DNA sequence: GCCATTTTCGCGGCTATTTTTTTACTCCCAAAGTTCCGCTATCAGTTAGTAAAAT
RNA sequence: AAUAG
């Protein structure tokens, strides 16, 4: 799951484009940032973050999980 | 595409289903193909190529 | 009209594996149906652009 | 046809 790219998350066009603009390439990268990075992402709206956290809740993960030895 | 049917159909009679709209049927077909092209639900069908 | 003799008819084991065959030969013409290239024209699909909507 | 059983 962690090694899977963000393109497996079924994100919207704007959400995927914003995450690519932030150069997030893997799920582990995204789940290591919380709102500290995502809410400050340019062009990333308020409803977008709600959608992302709903998706992660569907996948059983959350934001800002602390993982060692990544990558 | 004619799946589970005797004949294939063009956009006109597919629109004839509920809303006769070629531009709409074309958009929904494109959306369906885009969702089926997502790697989350296409690894099963990828093995048949 | 039955007793014998001659004439057809059908038969002669099961599994494998190596590998083609070959003569013989008019012509022309007019009439008819078919094909192949090129062009037209229509419809449907695809794609580019722009406005509508949402963040 | 030839060959093996």
From Swiss-Prot, chain A:
Gene: rpoA
Protein family per UniProt: Belongs to the RNA polymerase alpha chain family.
Region (Alpha C-terminal domain (alpha-CTD)): 1-71
Entry text on domains: The N-terminal domain is essential for RNAP assembly and basal transcription, whereas the C-terminal domain is involved in interaction with transcriptional regulators and with upstream promoter elements.
Keyword entries, A-Z: DNA-directed RNA polymerase, Nucleotidyltransferase, Transcription, Transferase
Single biological process term from Gene Ontology: DNA-templated transcription
Assembly: Homodimer. The RNAP catalytic core consists of 2 alpha, 1 beta, 1 beta' and 1 omega subunit. When a sigma factor is associated with the core the holoenzyme is formed, which can initiate transcription.
Function: DNA-dependent RNA polymerase catalyzes the transcription of DNA into RNA using the four ribonucleoside triphosphates as substrates.
Organism: Vibrio cholerae serotype O1 (strain ATCC 39541 / Classical Ogawa 395 / O395)
Cellular component GO terms held in the UniProt record: cytoplasm; DNA-directed RNA polymerase complex
Name of the protein this chain belongs to: DNA-directed RNA polymerase subunit alpha
GO molecular function: DNA binding; DNA-directed RNA polymerase activity; protein dimerization activity
Superkingdom as given in the UniProt entry: Bacteria
């Amino acid at each position: 799951i962690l090694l899977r790219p963000v393109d497996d998350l079924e994100l919207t066009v704007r959400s995927a484009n914003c995450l690519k603009a932030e150069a997030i390439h893997y799920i582990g990268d995204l789940v290591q940032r919380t709102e500290v990075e995502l809410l400050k992402t340019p062009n990333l709206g308020k409803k977008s973050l709600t959608e992302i956290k709903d998706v992660l809740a569907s996948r059983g993960l959350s934001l800002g999980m602390r993982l060692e030895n990544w990558p | 595409f004619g799946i589970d049917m005797n004949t294939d159909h063009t956009l006109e009679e597919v629109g004839k289903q509920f809303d006769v709209t070629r531009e709409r049927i074309r958009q929904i077909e494109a959306k369906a193909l885009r969702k089926l092209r997502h790697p989350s639900r296409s690894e099963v069908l990828r093995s048949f190529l």
